[PDB]
Amino acid sequence: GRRRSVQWCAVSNPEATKCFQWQRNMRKVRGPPVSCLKRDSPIQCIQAIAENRADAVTLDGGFIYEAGLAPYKLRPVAAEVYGTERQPRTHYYAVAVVKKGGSFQLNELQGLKSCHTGLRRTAGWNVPIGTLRPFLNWTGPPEPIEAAVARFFSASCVPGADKGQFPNLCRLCAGTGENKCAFSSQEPYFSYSGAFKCLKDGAGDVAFIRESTVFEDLSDEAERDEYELLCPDNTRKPVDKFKDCHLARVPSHAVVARSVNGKEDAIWNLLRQAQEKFGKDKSPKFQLFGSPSGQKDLLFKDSAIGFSRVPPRIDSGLYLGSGYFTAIQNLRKSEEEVAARRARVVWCAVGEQELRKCNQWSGLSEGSVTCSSASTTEDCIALVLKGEADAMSLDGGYVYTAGKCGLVPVLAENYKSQQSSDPDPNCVDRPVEGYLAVAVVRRSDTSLTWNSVKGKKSCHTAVDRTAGWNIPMGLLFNQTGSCKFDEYFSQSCAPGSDPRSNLCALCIGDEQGENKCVPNSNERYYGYTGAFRCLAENAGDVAFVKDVTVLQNTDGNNNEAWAKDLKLADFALLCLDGKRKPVTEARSCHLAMAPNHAVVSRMDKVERLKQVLLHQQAKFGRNGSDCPDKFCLFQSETKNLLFNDNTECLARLHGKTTYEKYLGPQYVAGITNLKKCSTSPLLEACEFLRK
Ligand SMILES: *[C@@H]1O[C@H](CO)[C@@H](O)[C@H](O)[C@H]1NC(C)=O
Ligand SMILES: O=C([O-])C(=O)[O-]
Ligand SMILES: [Cu+2]
Ligand SMILES: [Cu+2]
């Protein structure tokens, strides 16, 4: 014997106590069971959990950060919900409270006295210190920002600060003895309520807390009136103007568990039942979101209204946000190092071949481009959200996903026009024309037509790209109305599907029979060239590609082994009408017009990304000053690494700077429908992070 429960990590006595009561009432209702572990702080809870001696603990975004780092790598599993029942939210506001009577704004705090919730806390430290960075005159590492803050304000209360080294910072703490400035209840000016008390008692001039404290601690309304908020536009507004007067909107506290053998189920079952039974006003036996007249926020935030489960794709950095995550990292960086990182463009390369070319581009960018890599597009989009990568060129199917995630289209791949000019000097403002999606078959299969394609073997670029999957499956879906995308064709090579499905049946992995059905250039049947090879080698009977693919790959246009003897004349296109036409008539024989591949980024990098890309292609583009002498960005010769080998240039968007404006209504309308049949972990993660 041992236990059978979820072991909660208490970080204090009054917390072990309530944990205990929580344990009792779980039993006494025959609900899921919680056992309790004891520690003196959040980090100890972090390590206990990582060594398996507690299962979970609810932490402040500052400790979510900390906890994600190796060697811990804990993951947020359930977020606290605040606001109300019908105006519930998984975020809170970092505000700056002051008393009415003075007139000093957020830019005039030097030499004032401040009250903070705790060292490394979202609203008490990370946000305000980051907001005042520009007035601290901090020289950067190795002098801790602390020393810069200790010099900036006169005296402060900042629980957990090193009293030895940053005496000024513990200055205002009320604790008696070795308790003065503790990161615990011993220290009365601790957490939100202590920080507020600090201000209320007249000890500090500003309190750095959440929007709710004043309303939780001050009953009377007119009591509340003695205070006001310090807004970031150096204006003062009432404590109720938080939505229009906050330093930041940050993620709510969250329960973190191990990323490995986590017990997320358990934790989620326990939490769910507990909030049913013991939640917001509904069981005087026990109250999961209330604390003894002693206490404040024991185990969970007082007055949270419940839990919201975190989609399994979310890690600390996606939980935290590009914004907040980066802001925490920056606190440990010189401002030159921070300014260099913003000037630099970090490319996300999908697989090894693309990383190779990126390295090559990198060494020649004169430090303006650097590389990052993932093994799928979704992993690359997850690195750009985390701010660890910045850009990649994507298929319109990916433009939608990135877009539901908050990324915007910056420049689009411009291909040879419906002919406007020749080696076109205005390829940059020339509006994009789209690409044609076509179904290619062997000329000799005289019998094969659009209406007899179903049930045969197919070859697709990858799951979720326009020509290779949204178009063909969309068109099919629209007739049958079946979500069983694996019965449309009997055997396929659709990279990114279950390696065990029929949809991976014809894939061949790399040169060695590995990487079977992976959605990166590791699989030989991947992307446009690879969907085509699949056909040219009688693996499949149809290949969903773009017209240009066959030209580029037959008639010695490609002389890779497999391509060498193919002749354009052995292939034909299936038209919707039941006909068949030669490849040269794709203009009047296509499934549909696909939106151009586009490079996407975070909104914060748009302008610098534009700058960089216009300059780099000027040098390495099509009739680029260094190409082919030195480097051609738009050539990997039939492999389309980073960009399509046929990009004439990167063109402006002509105001379609939204995935919806860029993709168009029919288009969004259609991936939406297809997406119901099944969503991805990644749209599930952003659905959550958007809210
Ligand atoms: C920041 O630097 C400026 C001078 O260039 C100065 O006015 C200010 O006092 C400095 N910093 C502190 C102590 O916050
Ligand atoms: O459109 C497609 O199929 C692609 O870009 O792979
Ligand atoms: Cu907090
Ligand atoms: Cu495409």
XYZ file of C-alpha atoms and ligand atoms in Angstrom:
713
model
C 0.000 0.000 0.000
C 0.694 3.709 -0.485
C -2.297 5.752 -1.778
C -4.367 5.879 -5.095
C -4.857 9.556 -5.326
C -3.546 12.642 -6.977
C -0.974 14.115 -4.560
C -1.362 17.903 -4.334
C 1.737 19.862 -3.279
C 0.897 22.417 -0.531
C 3.451 25.225 -0.140
C 2.302 26.183 3.387
C 0.561 24.916 6.529
C -2.692 26.735 6.080
C -2.390 25.085 2.637
C -1.668 21.579 3.930
C -4.642 22.088 6.266
C -7.181 22.912 3.588
C -5.625 20.273 1.409
C -6.505 17.895 4.221
C -10.064 19.095 4.534
C -10.273 18.800 0.739
C -9.119 15.207 1.192
C -11.852 14.503 3.823
C -14.822 15.760 1.764
C -13.562 14.017 -1.341
C -13.931 10.674 0.671
C -17.200 11.784 2.360
C -18.921 12.163 -1.070
C -17.153 9.109 -2.462
C -15.373 11.317 -5.028
C -11.898 11.083 -6.525
C -9.196 11.350 -3.892
C -6.419 13.905 -3.254
C -3.472 13.047 -0.844
C -1.167 16.024 0.242
C 2.629 16.612 0.120
C 4.304 19.501 1.978
C 6.946 22.016 0.951
C 7.801 25.642 1.864
C 7.675 26.978 -1.621
C 6.611 26.836 -5.237
C 10.041 25.515 -6.500
C 10.032 22.698 -3.993
C 6.497 21.842 -5.306
C 8.068 22.040 -8.819
C 10.816 19.512 -7.916
C 8.599 17.179 -5.858
C 6.312 16.949 -8.906
C 9.249 16.313 -11.241
C 10.626 13.542 -8.902
C 7.202 12.072 -8.405
C 6.421 13.059 -4.803
C 3.430 15.420 -5.554
C 1.373 15.336 -8.754
C 0.238 18.871 -9.093
C 0.316 22.466 -7.811
C -1.400 25.667 -9.044
C 1.202 28.318 -10.042
C 1.365 31.909 -11.091
C 2.451 32.513 -14.685
C 5.918 33.432 -13.351
C 6.329 29.898 -11.989
C 4.680 28.262 -15.031
C 7.669 29.784 -16.877
C 10.130 28.415 -14.315
C 8.460 25.087 -14.117
C 8.663 24.552 -17.880
C 12.364 24.876 -17.975
C 14.480 21.728 -17.951
C 15.089 19.795 -15.917
C 11.434 20.046 -14.766
C 9.383 20.555 -17.900
C 6.035 20.506 -16.082
C 2.988 21.350 -18.229
C -0.149 23.345 -17.447
C -3.215 20.977 -17.396
C -6.148 23.145 -16.096
C -6.338 26.953 -15.953
C -8.241 28.852 -13.285
C -11.262 30.752 -14.497
C -12.041 34.202 -13.151
C -14.712 36.816 -13.849
C -18.142 35.180 -13.812
C -20.284 32.350 -14.786
C -21.309 34.197 -17.794
C -18.300 36.364 -18.383
C -15.790 33.752 -17.364
C -12.145 34.260 -18.427
C -8.806 32.559 -18.255
C -6.801 35.777 -18.036
C -6.495 38.656 -15.511
C -5.107 42.200 -15.811
C -1.827 43.405 -14.312
C -2.719 46.957 -12.937
C -0.944 49.612 -10.856
C -2.902 50.898 -7.881
C -2.536 54.162 -6.233
C -4.551 56.286 -3.769
C -6.429 59.448 -5.041
C -4.738 62.632 -3.851
C -1.525 62.770 -5.844
C -0.903 63.340 -9.520
C 2.105 61.334 -10.713
C 1.862 58.951 -13.619
C 3.519 55.733 -14.612
C 6.565 57.569 -15.971
C 7.171 59.499 -12.746
C 7.718 56.637 -10.221
C 11.479 56.910 -9.791
C 12.246 57.349 -6.125
C 8.619 56.469 -5.050
C 7.893 53.529 -2.727
C 6.337 50.413 -4.264
C 4.451 47.304 -3.117
C 4.886 44.111 -5.228
C 3.239 40.715 -4.889
C 6.448 38.629 -4.958
C 9.672 38.242 -6.898
C 8.986 36.621 -10.349
C 5.196 37.046 -10.118
C 3.221 38.112 -13.138
C 1.457 41.170 -11.928
C 3.766 41.835 -8.942
C 7.121 41.636 -10.832
C 7.467 40.473 -14.505
C 4.912 42.957 -15.945
C 5.776 46.180 -14.039
C 9.487 45.667 -14.204
C 9.230 45.041 -17.957
C 7.002 48.164 -18.381
C 9.513 50.358 -16.496
C 12.618 48.868 -18.090
C 13.171 52.105 -20.031
C 13.704 54.136 -16.822
C 15.816 51.766 -14.902
C 19.112 52.606 -16.717
C 19.944 48.901 -16.459
C 23.248 47.983 -17.881
C 22.191 44.348 -18.212
C 23.848 41.169 -17.202
C 25.555 40.341 -15.077
C 23.971 42.974 -12.757
C 20.579 41.580 -11.869
C 17.675 43.782 -12.790
C 17.017 43.804 -9.081
C 19.904 46.154 -8.372
C 18.554 48.457 -11.091
C 15.070 48.378 -9.429
C 16.426 48.845 -5.872
C 18.093 52.056 -7.114
C 15.027 53.226 -9.011
C 12.497 53.151 -6.195
C 13.304 54.450 -2.709
C 12.171 51.426 -0.703
C 9.799 48.646 -1.662
C 8.288 45.475 -0.368
C 9.212 42.586 -2.858
C 8.765 39.234 -1.175
C 11.311 36.635 -1.948
C 14.000 39.337 -2.897
C 17.503 38.760 -1.494
C 17.436 40.986 1.622
C 21.149 40.578 1.930
C 21.906 41.889 -1.496
C 18.838 44.009 -2.277
C 18.017 45.419 1.063
C 16.040 48.283 -0.415
C 13.607 45.788 -1.934
C 12.726 44.194 1.464
C 12.691 47.666 2.921
C 8.901 48.045 3.259
C 8.136 44.410 4.132
C 6.201 44.038 7.424
C 7.434 40.521 8.467
C 9.149 40.333 11.849
C 12.570 38.738 11.970
C 13.656 36.245 9.390
C 10.108 36.613 8.103
C 10.647 40.158 6.957
C 10.334 39.800 3.166
C 9.570 36.045 2.986
C 7.751 34.582 -0.001
C 4.959 33.400 2.257
C 2.104 34.413 4.597
C 4.542 35.073 7.392
C 5.126 38.142 5.375
C 1.962 40.178 5.663
C 2.658 42.246 2.557
C 2.794 39.109 0.436
C 0.730 38.283 -2.640
C -2.001 40.431 -3.965
C -3.766 41.146 -0.752
C -0.480 41.888 1.178
C 0.731 44.173 -1.639
C -2.575 46.053 -1.423
C -2.342 46.258 2.364
C 1.196 47.641 1.891
C -0.320 50.502 -0.169
C -3.410 50.863 2.032
C -1.237 51.247 5.263
C 0.561 54.050 3.473
C 3.809 52.064 3.324
C 4.342 52.290 -0.578
C 2.866 54.763 -3.137
C 1.897 52.179 -5.838
C 0.707 48.597 -5.615
C 1.366 46.104 -8.491
C -1.511 43.576 -8.353
C -4.514 42.148 -10.303
C -7.703 44.148 -11.161
C -9.777 42.236 -8.664
C -7.931 42.813 -5.280
C -9.495 46.212 -4.467
C -12.976 44.783 -5.008
C -12.099 41.679 -3.030
C -10.617 43.552 -0.086
C -12.769 46.684 0.028
C -16.388 45.982 0.777
C -17.808 49.437 0.812
C -17.876 51.039 -2.626
C -16.755 54.566 -1.458
C -13.901 52.852 0.342
C -12.796 51.860 -3.172
C -13.002 55.383 -4.339
C -9.871 56.379 -2.437
C -7.998 54.548 -5.153
C -7.333 54.763 -8.854
C -5.306 53.063 -11.615
C -2.131 54.237 -13.287
C -2.640 53.685 -16.974
C 0.060 53.223 -19.425
C -0.787 56.444 -21.357
C 0.199 58.158 -18.213
C -3.398 58.913 -17.305
C -5.330 58.010 -14.063
C -8.775 56.292 -14.317
C -10.993 54.482 -11.744
C -10.398 51.040 -10.493
C -13.219 49.876 -12.695
C -11.507 51.132 -15.916
C -9.027 48.190 -15.818
C -10.012 46.935 -19.262
C -8.950 50.419 -20.503
C -6.180 50.863 -17.951
C -3.959 47.855 -17.302
C -0.261 47.178 -17.744
C -1.027 43.787 -19.300
C -3.567 41.002 -19.829
C -1.908 37.770 -18.754
C -2.835 34.128 -18.585
C -4.585 32.914 -15.377
C -2.777 30.709 -12.795
C -2.707 26.987 -13.847
C -2.249 23.554 -12.300
C 0.920 22.010 -13.840
C 1.657 18.252 -14.026
C 4.550 16.317 -15.584
C 4.737 16.261 -19.386
C 5.658 12.521 -19.291
C 3.736 10.282 -16.913
C 1.524 13.099 -15.707
C -1.767 11.841 -14.538
C -3.580 14.566 -16.390
C -6.792 12.422 -16.561
C -6.820 11.931 -12.862
C -6.042 15.533 -12.150
C -8.747 16.605 -14.540
C -11.298 14.106 -13.071
C -10.506 15.200 -9.480
C -10.817 18.939 -10.413
C -14.035 18.525 -12.350
C -15.906 16.641 -9.517
C -14.458 18.964 -6.903
C -15.687 22.005 -8.661
C -19.131 20.372 -9.055
C -19.402 19.415 -5.369
C -17.219 21.921 -3.543
C -17.049 24.795 -6.114
C -18.532 28.352 -6.168
C -21.250 28.495 -3.490
C -22.326 24.943 -3.125
C -21.243 23.094 -0.027
C -20.746 24.764 3.339
C -18.923 21.524 4.310
C -15.919 22.683 2.174
C -15.072 25.470 -0.265
C -12.448 24.869 -2.893
C -12.212 28.646 -3.709
C -12.517 30.249 -0.270
C -10.027 30.663 2.593
C -10.172 30.834 6.438
C -10.494 34.315 7.899
C -6.841 33.831 8.511
C -5.840 33.153 4.903
C -5.849 34.181 1.337
C -5.754 32.150 -1.884
C -5.115 28.725 -0.369
C -4.428 26.145 -3.041
C -6.367 28.051 -5.669
C -7.268 31.695 -6.096
C -10.010 32.827 -3.794
C -13.136 33.346 -5.801
C -11.847 31.621 -9.039
C -15.096 30.227 -10.631
C -13.701 26.838 -11.808
C -11.091 25.161 -14.089
C -10.743 25.089 -17.857
C -8.732 22.134 -19.143
C -5.644 22.878 -21.276
C -5.508 21.152 -24.730
C -2.760 18.591 -24.749
C -0.623 20.530 -27.269
C 0.066 23.482 -24.868
C 3.371 23.735 -23.169
C 4.435 26.628 -20.863
C 5.572 28.823 -23.606
C 2.371 28.469 -25.731
C 0.388 28.809 -22.480
C 2.153 32.043 -21.702
C 1.941 33.750 -25.084
C 4.553 35.101 -27.475
C 4.263 38.391 -25.616
C 4.518 37.365 -21.967
C 6.854 34.488 -22.640
C 9.379 36.754 -24.395
C 8.914 39.476 -21.830
C 10.136 37.017 -19.089
C 13.157 35.933 -21.166
C 14.101 39.559 -21.878
C 14.390 40.388 -18.169
C 17.597 38.409 -18.277
C 18.970 40.101 -21.371
C 20.841 43.268 -22.228
C 18.851 45.679 -24.298
C 21.307 45.251 -27.199
C 20.847 41.569 -27.138
C 16.997 42.263 -27.075
C 17.325 44.784 -29.942
C 19.424 42.391 -31.980
C 16.888 39.630 -31.638
C 14.118 41.818 -32.863
C 16.145 42.958 -35.979
C 16.943 39.400 -36.863
C 14.569 37.117 -38.714
C 14.526 33.480 -37.529
C 13.361 31.087 -40.324
C 11.548 27.898 -39.562
C 12.831 25.034 -41.727
C 10.722 21.843 -41.897
C 13.120 18.866 -42.012
C 16.847 18.613 -42.584
C 17.024 19.473 -46.336
C 15.268 22.724 -45.696
C 17.459 23.374 -42.659
C 20.509 22.875 -44.929
C 19.443 25.524 -47.430
C 18.446 27.805 -44.597
C 22.005 27.527 -43.117
C 23.314 28.325 -46.562
C 21.034 31.409 -46.800
C 21.936 32.325 -43.286
C 25.714 32.517 -43.666
C 25.028 34.962 -46.617
C 22.422 37.216 -44.964
C 25.043 39.433 -43.225
C 23.427 38.420 -39.964
C 19.815 39.299 -40.934
C 18.490 35.724 -41.168
C 18.916 32.841 -38.863
C 17.510 29.326 -38.765
C 15.215 27.185 -36.789
C 13.770 23.758 -37.507
C 10.895 21.332 -36.637
C 9.868 18.029 -38.221
C 6.356 19.231 -39.337
C 4.785 22.577 -40.312
C 2.576 22.523 -37.242
C 5.790 22.364 -35.004
C 7.207 25.295 -36.991
C 3.933 27.270 -36.523
C 4.105 26.279 -32.785
C 7.749 27.713 -32.721
C 6.643 31.051 -34.227
C 3.814 31.462 -31.697
C 6.397 30.937 -28.869
C 8.450 33.602 -30.552
C 11.257 31.108 -30.949
C 11.072 31.266 -34.777
C 9.574 34.056 -36.833
C 8.563 33.080 -40.416
C 8.014 30.398 -42.973
C 6.349 30.261 -46.399
C 3.146 28.224 -46.172
C 0.547 26.487 -48.382
C -2.882 28.282 -48.174
C -4.136 25.262 -46.040
C -1.501 26.273 -43.440
C -2.277 29.995 -43.882
C -5.727 29.224 -42.459
C -4.291 27.246 -39.425
C -1.609 29.906 -38.708
C -4.300 32.419 -39.098
C -6.703 30.835 -36.653
C -3.621 31.062 -34.401
C -3.076 34.755 -34.856
C -0.235 34.842 -37.435
C -0.687 37.085 -40.485
C 0.215 36.723 -44.199
C 3.141 39.156 -44.993
C 4.227 38.558 -48.655
C 3.060 35.941 -51.122
C 5.011 33.693 -53.546
C 4.408 35.302 -57.002
C 4.655 32.814 -59.916
C 4.899 33.462 -63.669
C 1.800 35.445 -64.711
C -1.151 34.803 -66.989
C 1.667 36.605 -68.632
C 1.884 40.348 -67.965
C 5.566 40.759 -68.757
C 8.643 38.547 -69.157
C 11.407 38.432 -66.458
C 9.024 40.913 -64.858
C 10.532 43.911 -63.091
C 7.300 44.535 -61.154
C 6.968 41.110 -59.923
C 6.709 42.819 -56.472
C 3.483 44.749 -57.011
C 2.080 42.419 -59.608
C -0.992 41.005 -57.759
C -0.870 37.237 -57.278
C -2.851 35.039 -59.698
C -3.188 31.775 -57.734
C -2.080 28.296 -58.891
C -4.218 25.634 -60.597
C -4.970 22.382 -58.647
C -5.044 19.368 -61.084
C -5.379 15.594 -60.999
C -2.676 13.948 -63.131
C -2.956 10.389 -64.564
C -0.907 8.231 -66.954
C -1.987 8.831 -70.558
C -2.270 5.071 -71.001
C -5.120 4.710 -68.411
C -7.542 5.761 -71.052
C -10.442 4.608 -68.822
C -9.773 6.724 -65.731
C -11.905 9.904 -65.429
C -12.979 12.212 -62.477
C -16.124 10.094 -61.784
C -14.111 6.793 -61.891
C -11.122 8.040 -59.722
C -12.853 7.062 -56.417
C -11.666 3.698 -55.092
C -8.342 3.809 -57.046
C -4.924 4.597 -55.497
C -4.003 8.254 -54.986
C -0.959 10.402 -54.406
C -1.174 13.558 -52.360
C 1.341 16.343 -51.535
C 0.349 16.113 -47.824
C -2.767 16.191 -45.654
C -3.986 19.795 -45.312
C -2.333 21.581 -48.350
C -4.639 22.949 -51.073
C -3.789 21.100 -54.278
C -2.947 17.781 -52.637
C -5.794 17.591 -50.142
C -8.223 20.442 -49.426
C -9.381 20.537 -53.188
C -9.653 16.889 -54.124
C -11.023 15.774 -50.724
C -13.197 18.859 -50.468
C -14.780 18.159 -53.860
C -15.297 14.482 -52.876
C -16.576 15.374 -49.427
C -19.100 17.679 -51.042
C -20.722 14.712 -52.943
C -20.718 11.881 -50.466
C -20.774 13.932 -47.269
C -18.548 11.260 -45.591
C -15.857 12.243 -43.092
C -14.119 8.934 -43.617
C -11.381 10.407 -45.764
C -9.670 6.999 -45.692
C -12.293 5.242 -47.837
C -12.272 7.790 -50.684
C -9.343 5.959 -52.217
C -8.286 2.381 -51.534
C -4.525 3.120 -50.951
C -2.703 6.368 -50.809
C 0.391 8.237 -50.009
C -0.873 11.279 -48.092
C 2.097 12.378 -45.888
C 0.984 13.362 -42.390
C -1.710 10.621 -41.964
C -1.646 7.641 -39.633
C 1.322 5.479 -40.663
C -1.043 2.605 -40.086
C -3.919 3.916 -42.265
C -4.581 3.129 -45.954
C -3.622 6.788 -46.427
C 0.030 5.947 -45.730
C -0.125 2.642 -47.620
C 1.746 3.746 -50.754
C 4.402 5.976 -48.968
C 8.032 5.017 -49.086
C 9.955 6.953 -46.410
C 13.546 7.930 -47.247
C 16.239 6.136 -49.138
C 16.289 3.589 -46.401
C 12.601 2.956 -45.827
C 12.405 5.152 -42.774
C 10.374 8.321 -42.423
C 7.439 6.519 -44.058
C 4.545 8.893 -44.498
C 6.170 11.781 -42.635
C 5.128 15.207 -43.888
C 8.572 16.556 -44.705
C 11.020 16.008 -47.568
C 12.249 12.857 -45.735
C 9.442 10.924 -47.397
C 10.243 10.499 -51.206
C 6.521 10.812 -52.152
C 6.201 14.169 -50.308
C 5.111 17.503 -51.672
C 4.400 18.272 -55.283
C 7.422 16.534 -56.850
C 6.921 13.526 -54.596
C 3.086 13.269 -55.229
C 4.101 13.196 -58.954
C 6.899 10.651 -58.561
C 4.278 8.428 -56.812
C 2.332 8.436 -60.054
C 5.294 8.259 -62.416
C 6.282 5.087 -60.650
C 2.921 3.440 -60.738
C 2.502 3.612 -57.035
C -0.801 5.584 -57.340
C -3.148 6.203 -60.315
C -3.880 9.849 -59.662
C -1.625 12.585 -58.101
C -3.135 15.834 -56.811
C -0.439 18.477 -57.635
C -0.348 21.875 -59.516
C -0.020 21.980 -63.324
C 3.575 23.293 -63.377
C 4.748 20.133 -61.532
C 4.560 17.851 -64.521
C 6.424 20.314 -66.816
C 9.107 20.840 -64.224
C 9.482 17.026 -63.913
C 9.279 15.530 -67.408
C 11.221 16.090 -70.593
C 14.601 16.269 -68.896
C 13.322 19.264 -66.946
C 14.378 17.069 -63.998
C 16.974 14.395 -64.535
C 16.937 12.814 -61.089
C 17.040 9.063 -61.781
C 13.384 8.428 -61.498
C 12.534 11.546 -63.574
C 15.033 11.266 -66.432
C 12.871 9.575 -69.123
C 9.393 10.881 -68.369
C 7.829 12.791 -71.200
C 5.098 15.329 -70.754
C 2.966 13.367 -73.294
C 2.480 10.295 -71.008
C 0.380 12.245 -68.589
C -3.001 13.868 -68.875
C -5.280 15.864 -66.596
C -8.835 14.663 -65.411
C -11.343 17.496 -65.878
C -14.425 17.819 -63.810
C -16.661 17.247 -66.783
C -15.419 13.654 -67.206
C -13.032 14.645 -70.015
C -9.282 14.318 -70.144
C -6.987 16.937 -71.615
C -3.240 17.189 -72.020
C -1.201 19.028 -69.300
C -0.789 22.059 -71.476
C -4.546 22.716 -71.214
C -4.757 22.823 -67.422
C -6.145 26.308 -67.790
C -9.410 24.744 -68.999
C -8.922 21.456 -67.081
C -8.430 22.001 -63.330
C -10.176 21.101 -60.047
C -9.647 24.690 -58.818
C -7.503 27.825 -58.296
C -5.333 27.572 -55.137
C -4.295 30.740 -53.228
C -0.523 31.443 -53.520
C 1.800 30.082 -50.824
C 2.451 33.008 -48.440
C 5.025 33.858 -45.835
C 3.437 34.314 -42.406
C 4.725 35.958 -39.238
C 3.668 37.452 -35.896
C 2.287 40.937 -36.154
C 5.231 42.291 -34.226
C 7.692 41.216 -36.969
C 5.775 42.182 -40.156
C 7.647 45.338 -41.017
C 11.157 44.124 -40.271
C 10.367 40.817 -42.080
C 9.294 42.773 -45.117
C 12.479 44.802 -45.120
C 14.659 41.778 -44.786
C 12.881 39.692 -47.476
C 12.805 42.512 -50.097
C 16.510 43.116 -49.521
C 17.496 39.393 -49.552
C 15.691 38.503 -52.800
C 17.155 41.564 -54.440
C 20.333 39.736 -53.887
C 19.316 36.070 -54.117
C 15.997 36.093 -55.984
C 15.247 35.132 -59.633
C 17.218 37.736 -61.569
C 18.915 38.397 -58.252
C 22.246 40.057 -57.913
C 24.033 36.940 -56.441
C 22.077 34.209 -58.012
C 23.228 31.843 -59.396
C 26.636 33.176 -58.897
C 26.341 32.723 -55.212
C 22.855 31.764 -54.045
C 19.349 31.358 -55.392
C 16.749 31.458 -52.725
C 14.024 30.219 -55.053
C 15.877 27.201 -56.363
C 16.480 23.753 -54.753
C 15.870 22.477 -58.212
C 12.562 20.457 -58.145
C 12.476 20.028 -54.322
C 10.863 23.388 -53.443
C 12.804 23.830 -50.080
C 11.619 26.921 -48.195
C 9.939 28.341 -51.296
C 8.508 26.966 -54.579
C 11.216 26.634 -57.234
C 8.873 28.681 -59.492
C 8.519 31.779 -57.287
C 9.352 34.791 -59.527
C 9.509 36.870 -56.285
C 7.700 37.670 -52.981
C 4.896 40.199 -53.756
C 3.003 42.698 -51.538
C -0.522 41.683 -50.482
C -2.500 44.636 -51.727
C -4.315 44.991 -48.425
C -5.289 41.300 -47.887
C -3.294 41.170 -44.666
C -5.598 38.752 -42.892
C -5.790 35.048 -43.523
C -9.432 35.578 -44.436
C -8.985 38.444 -46.722
C -5.992 36.639 -48.247
C -7.622 33.161 -48.544
C -11.134 34.371 -49.453
C -14.579 33.301 -48.260
C -15.182 30.271 -50.439
C -11.847 29.041 -49.242
C -12.192 29.628 -45.504
C -15.736 28.446 -45.864
C -14.502 25.195 -47.229
C -11.623 24.346 -44.856
C -14.024 25.046 -42.053
C -16.450 22.440 -43.269
C -13.676 19.836 -43.779
C -12.204 20.591 -40.406
C -15.323 19.328 -38.472
C -14.614 15.835 -39.678
C -11.687 16.295 -37.431
C -9.648 19.134 -35.919
C -5.977 19.051 -35.086
C -4.303 19.429 -31.746
C -2.892 22.710 -33.005
C -6.309 24.284 -33.863
C -7.516 22.924 -30.493
C -4.582 24.673 -28.768
C -5.278 28.045 -30.471
C -9.055 27.723 -30.036
C -8.123 27.804 -26.285
C -5.436 30.482 -26.451
C -7.695 32.785 -28.467
C -10.706 32.894 -26.209
C 18.172 56.975 -16.217
O 19.015 57.795 -16.993
C 18.761 59.087 -17.092
C 19.943 59.913 -17.695
O 20.358 59.769 -19.021
C 18.436 59.703 -15.666
O 17.661 60.871 -15.830
C 17.828 58.768 -14.635
O 17.964 59.358 -13.391
C 18.380 57.355 -14.748
N 17.983 56.340 -13.885
C 17.546 55.880 -12.711
C 18.348 56.075 -11.526
O 16.401 55.385 -12.648
O -0.851 22.730 -52.565
C -0.273 21.722 -52.202
O -0.725 20.541 -52.350
C 1.116 21.923 -51.514
O 1.411 23.117 -51.488
O 1.691 20.815 -51.215
Cu -0.690 35.701 -10.155
Cu 0.213 24.396 -52.250
